[PDB]
Amino acid sequence: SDAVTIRTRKVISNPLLARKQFVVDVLHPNRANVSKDELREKLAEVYKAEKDAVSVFGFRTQFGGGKSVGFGLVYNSVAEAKKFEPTYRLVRYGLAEKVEKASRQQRKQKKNRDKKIFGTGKRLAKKVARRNAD
Amino acid sequence: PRAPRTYSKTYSTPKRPYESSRLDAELKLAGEFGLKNKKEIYRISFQLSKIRRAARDLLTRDEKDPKRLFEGNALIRRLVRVGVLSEDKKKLDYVLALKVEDFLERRLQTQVYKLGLAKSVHHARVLITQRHIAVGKQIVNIPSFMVRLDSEKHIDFAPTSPFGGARPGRVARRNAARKAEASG
Amino acid sequence: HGSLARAGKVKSQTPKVEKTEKPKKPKGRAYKRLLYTRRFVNVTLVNGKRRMNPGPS
Amino acid sequence: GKGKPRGLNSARKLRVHRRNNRWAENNYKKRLLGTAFKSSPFGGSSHAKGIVLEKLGIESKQPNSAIRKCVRVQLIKNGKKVTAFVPNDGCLNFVDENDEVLLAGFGRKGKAKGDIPGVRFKVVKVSGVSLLALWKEKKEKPRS
RNA sequence: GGAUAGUGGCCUACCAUGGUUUCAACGGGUAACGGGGAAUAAGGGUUCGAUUCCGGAGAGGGAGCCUGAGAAACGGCUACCACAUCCAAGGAAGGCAGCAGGCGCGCAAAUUACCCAAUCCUAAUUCAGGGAGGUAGUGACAAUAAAUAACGAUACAGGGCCCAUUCGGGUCUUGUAAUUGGAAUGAGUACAAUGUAAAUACCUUAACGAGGAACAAUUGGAGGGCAAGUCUGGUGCCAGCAGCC
C-alpha cells in the first residue's frame, strides 16, 4: 500500500492457454515481504479484470531485502483459470478444497492387499465366517 | 542420476611452509589490507597465477593469430573493466606483471578506506561484515567484492541501514528512549 | 637394578599446576592485526636479530 | 651411442627394456606383486583393529633399559600377531587385559621409527576411545 | 546339408596336418568391467578411473524355457548346494548387488520419513502409477565467502614530523587498562514470509537479543630442516620425546 509499486516484465500473451505470463517485481522498503494474496488483490483492483484469474508465485527476496521478484499469471476467465491451474496452487490460494487421502505408504499397502485378494471378496468373507462357525 | 555440479578450488598453499621473507610479506600485506586469513592472499595469488598463465599461453601463439587477438582482447577488457590497466596504453607490461598488491588495493574493503568512508581499514571491514554497505540498490557484506569503477557514481549506504537513515538502530533506540525517560 | 616399576613415572609425579586466568586473546582479523602491530610497527628489540621472545639477560 | 637403442623402429626394445628395469624399484615391485595384499600385516590398509594379548620379554634399542610392556596384538581380519608401541607417557592405564586397540603405522611405510627395534605400529584408540583423549583426560575409557 | 532372422565349423558326411607363434602365440596372474575422465606441462607426465554420461555383464552360481516385437527376464517360471518363511508335523514355496532398515565383515560409509510439487516414463492414456526423481533427516567426503569484534582523561611499548623561550604544546594520529561510556551487528526463541498443500535451513520483523568469571578457537606447540624459551619447577640415559639427525 505505502509505495509498494508493483511492476511487471516480459508480459507475453498466449491464446493457447488463453492467459498472460510475466515476471513481477515488487519494491517494498520497510516490509517483511508482500504476500501473494495481497499481490492478487492489488492486481485485481488495478486491472478491474477478475479476482481469481491472477496467479503469483516464486517471489525470492533480494539479499538485504527491500525487493522481491516472482512469476505472475493472469487468465482470460475463471473457468479457464480453474481448468489450467495446478491443484496445489488452487488449494493454496483457497480456490479449491483440499482432498482427503491417506499417506502413500497406507495407499500402497492397501493396493498390495487388494491385489492379494482376487475379485470382489464377499465369497471369501462368507466362507471364512462359515469356517469359523463350523 | 543428476548431472554433477562442478566445484573448483580458489587458492593455493605455498610450496615451502616456513619462508621467513614470505611470511613477513604476507603478514604485512594482510595487516595493511585488513585480511582475516592467509587464505585471502592465497586466493588472490591463485587468480593472479591463473591470469599470468593465460597471458603466457596467449603470447605462445604467433603474432596476428585470431585466437591470440581475441583472447588477449577479452583478458585486457576484463582487466580494464576491473580498472587496473591504463585506459590509453596497450603495452601489456602491466598484463604480464599484475601484482597481489594491485589486486588487494583494487578490492572492495580497501576501496572504502581509499575513498574515505570509514577512515580505518578494520572499521571498514567491520562495516561491510555488519552489512552497512550498498554498491547500488543491493547490499553486499563481502569485503572481497572487487568493484569495477562503475558504481563509483552510485556508492552510498543502504536505506535499510542505520547511519544510512530512517531507523535508529538496535542499541540507538534503547539508549535514546532510556535517556528520554531519565530526563523526563 | 630392580627396575620392574615406574610405568608412567613423570606424568604421575609431576605437580598439578592450573592454567592462570588471563584475558582472552583476539581471534581472526583482530589477532592478525595484533601480530602485525607487535611485529612491524613496534621497535621493542631490533638490535641484533629482531628476536620474538626477549628473555631476561 | 650412449647404450640405449636409438633407431626409429626400436620402440619395442625400449619398452621391453623399461619393463624389465622397472622391477629394480622397491615400490613398483611391491605394487605389481601385491605384497600388501599377500604378506603385509595390515593387508594394505591404513589402520587395523586388534586384541592385545600378553607381555613378552623384549628390550628397547639404544639408549635405555626398559622391560615393562609393548603390546602384542592379534588382528581380527588376518589373525596375525604384531607388536605395537603405546605412543604416550603413562602406558599402564590402558593395557589392562584383552582390550581392543586400533593400530596405525609408524609413518615409515613399514619400518621401525626410532629406538624401538622391531615395532612398526602404534596405538591410537583403546576400546573405541582415543589414546590421547585418555592421555589428556578429556575422555574416559568405559569403566562400566 | 540342418539351424538361425540372417552370413559363418554354429553342427553333420568326405578330403589336409592345415591355422597361430620370439613382431611373444599358448599358459598363468590381475587386491582387471572398458571408455568419456581428477590431480601436471607450450614437451618429463605417474598413478587412479567401483562410482552421476556411453557401451558390457549379472540379479546366489550353473543350466532350460513359455509368453512376447523385444527376455535365456530371475520384483517370470522349471531343477541342487550353505541358508530357510511352519504347523495342529500332510504342506505351499526360493533368494533386497531397487529404496529404507538389520545382522556378519570390517579402518571404513545415513532415516525401516514425506511428495508426484520442480524433471522424464508407459498402452486403452489431459485425471493412474513411479523407493525413477525431488524433498525432509545424519553427515567436518570434498568445494565458496566468511562471527569471534570498531573509538575516549591517564600513562606505557614510543613508525614518518614542527615552533631556535634546551622532553612544553603537540598539528596528521600505530597498539595495550584490572579506574569507565549518547556507536554498529551475528547465532537462536517466532506468530508474519517463500521453489513446501498443513514446516523448522538462507537474508526480512513487535519483542527477547553483547561487555570481555559475556554467547568464551581449536589443532600442531618453538634444537636443525623450519625464526623465537639457556626466563621457572619435577625426574635424572628413568619417564618419555623425536618422520631424520
JSON list of N, CA and C (backbone and C1' of nucleotides) in Angstrom, two decimals, chain E residues 19-21 24-27:
[
{"chain": "E", "resi": 19, "resn": "G", "atom": "P", "xyz": [48.21, -72.84, -43.37]},
{"chain": "E", "resi": 19, "resn": "G", "atom": "O5'", "xyz": [47.40, -72.51, -42.03]},
{"chain": "E", "resi": 19, "resn": "G", "atom": "C5'", "xyz": [46.35, -71.56, -42.03]},
{"chain": "E", "resi": 19, "resn": "G", "atom": "C4'", "xyz": [45.87, -71.24, -40.64]},
{"chain": "E", "resi": 19, "resn": "G", "atom": "C3'", "xyz": [46.85, -70.49, -39.75]},
{"chain": "E", "resi": 19, "resn": "G", "atom": "O3'", "xyz": [46.87, -69.10, -39.98]},
{"chain": "E", "resi": 19, "resn": "G", "atom": "C1'", "xyz": [45.97, -72.32, -38.56]},
{"chain": "E", "resi": 20, "resn": "U", "atom": "P", "xyz": [48.24, -68.28, -39.85]},
{"chain": "E", "resi": 20, "resn": "U", "atom": "O5'", "xyz": [48.47, -68.17, -38.28]},
{"chain": "E", "resi": 20, "resn": "U", "atom": "C5'", "xyz": [47.55, -67.47, -37.46]},
{"chain": "E", "resi": 20, "resn": "U", "atom": "C4'", "xyz": [47.95, -67.54, -36.01]},
{"chain": "E", "resi": 20, "resn": "U", "atom": "C3'", "xyz": [49.38, -67.16, -35.70]},
{"chain": "E", "resi": 20, "resn": "U", "atom": "O3'", "xyz": [49.60, -65.76, -35.66]},
{"chain": "E", "resi": 20, "resn": "U", "atom": "C1'", "xyz": [48.85, -69.16, -34.58]},
{"chain": "E", "resi": 21, "resn": "U", "atom": "P", "xyz": [50.95, -65.14, -36.29]},
{"chain": "E", "resi": 21, "resn": "U", "atom": "O5'", "xyz": [52.07, -65.52, -35.22]},
{"chain": "E", "resi": 21, "resn": "U", "atom": "C5'", "xyz": [51.90, -65.20, -33.85]},
{"chain": "E", "resi": 21, "resn": "U", "atom": "C4'", "xyz": [52.84, -65.99, -32.97]},
{"chain": "E", "resi": 21, "resn": "U", "atom": "C3'", "xyz": [54.31, -65.88, -33.31]},
{"chain": "E", "resi": 21, "resn": "U", "atom": "O3'", "xyz": [54.90, -64.67, -32.89]},
{"chain": "E", "resi": 21, "resn": "U", "atom": "C1'", "xyz": [53.77, -68.14, -32.91]},
{"chain": "E", "resi": 24, "resn": "A", "atom": "P", "xyz": [54.73, -59.56, -30.66]},
{"chain": "E", "resi": 24, "resn": "A", "atom": "O5'", "xyz": [53.83, -60.88, -30.58]},
{"chain": "E", "resi": 24, "resn": "A", "atom": "C5'", "xyz": [54.39, -62.17, -30.80]},
{"chain": "E", "resi": 24, "resn": "A", "atom": "C4'", "xyz": [54.27, -63.05, -29.58]},
{"chain": "E", "resi": 24, "resn": "A", "atom": "C3'", "xyz": [53.60, -62.39, -28.37]},
{"chain": "E", "resi": 24, "resn": "A", "atom": "O3'", "xyz": [52.90, -63.38, -27.62]},
{"chain": "E", "resi": 24, "resn": "A", "atom": "C1'", "xyz": [55.79, -63.03, -27.80]},
{"chain": "E", "resi": 25, "resn": "A", "atom": "P", "xyz": [51.45, -63.07, -27.02]},
{"chain": "E", "resi": 25, "resn": "A", "atom": "O5'", "xyz": [50.51, -64.13, -27.74]},
{"chain": "E", "resi": 25, "resn": "A", "atom": "C5'", "xyz": [50.19, -64.01, -29.12]},
{"chain": "E", "resi": 25, "resn": "A", "atom": "C4'", "xyz": [50.09, -65.35, -29.79]},
{"chain": "E", "resi": 25, "resn": "A", "atom": "C3'", "xyz": [49.35, -66.43, -29.01]},
{"chain": "E", "resi": 25, "resn": "A", "atom": "O3'", "xyz": [47.94, -66.32, -29.10]},
{"chain": "E", "resi": 25, "resn": "A", "atom": "C1'", "xyz": [51.36, -67.32, -29.87]},
{"chain": "E", "resi": 26, "resn": "C", "atom": "P", "xyz": [47.04, -66.38, -27.77]},
{"chain": "E", "resi": 26, "resn": "C", "atom": "O5'", "xyz": [47.42, -67.78, -27.11]},
{"chain": "E", "resi": 26, "resn": "C", "atom": "C5'", "xyz": [47.04, -69.01, -27.70]},
{"chain": "E", "resi": 26, "resn": "C", "atom": "C4'", "xyz": [47.66, -70.18, -26.98]},
{"chain": "E", "resi": 26, "resn": "C", "atom": "C3'", "xyz": [47.43, -70.23, -25.48]},
{"chain": "E", "resi": 26, "resn": "C", "atom": "O3'", "xyz": [46.17, -70.76, -25.11]},
{"chain": "E", "resi": 26, "resn": "C", "atom": "C1'", "xyz": [49.72, -70.55, -25.92]},
{"chain": "E", "resi": 27, "resn": "G", "atom": "P", "xyz": [45.40, -70.20, -23.82]},
{"chain": "E", "resi": 27, "resn": "G", "atom": "O5'", "xyz": [46.41, -70.47, -22.61]},
{"chain": "E", "resi": 27, "resn": "G", "atom": "C5'", "xyz": [46.61, -71.78, -22.12]},
{"chain": "E", "resi": 27, "resn": "G", "atom": "C4'", "xyz": [47.66, -71.82, -21.03]},
{"chain": "E", "resi": 27, "resn": "G", "atom": "C3'", "xyz": [47.38, -70.97, -19.80]},
{"chain": "E", "resi": 27, "resn": "G", "atom": "O3'", "xyz": [46.45, -71.55, -18.91]},
{"chain": "E", "resi": 27, "resn": "G", "atom": "C1'", "xyz": [49.60, -70.63, -20.49]}
]
